[PDB]
Amino acid sequence: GSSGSSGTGEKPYKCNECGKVFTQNSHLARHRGIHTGEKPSGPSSG
Ligand SMILES: [Zn+2]
Numbered sequence: 001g002s003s004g005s006s007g008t009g010e011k012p013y014k015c016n017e018c019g020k021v022f023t024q025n026s027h028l029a030r031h032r033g034i035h036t037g038e039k040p041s042g043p044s045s046g
Contacts, residue, residue, distance in 0.1 A: 013022040017035035022028040039045070 009021045011021050011023065013025060013028040014020065015022075015028060015032055015035075017032060020028075020031060022031065
């Protein structure tokens with residue numbers, strides 16, 4: 001058998017990088033910024 005946890009915070013504005021939840025798009029998009037910023041050293045991407 002298994003146990004499935006059930007938390008409270010399911011919204012269409014939930015981030016994927018970390019897994020945060022918001023109410024307004026802006027609040028979310030702006031948050032995602034924390035993830036999208038610094039660049040990976042080396043030509044890995046470029
Ligand atoms: Zn996030």
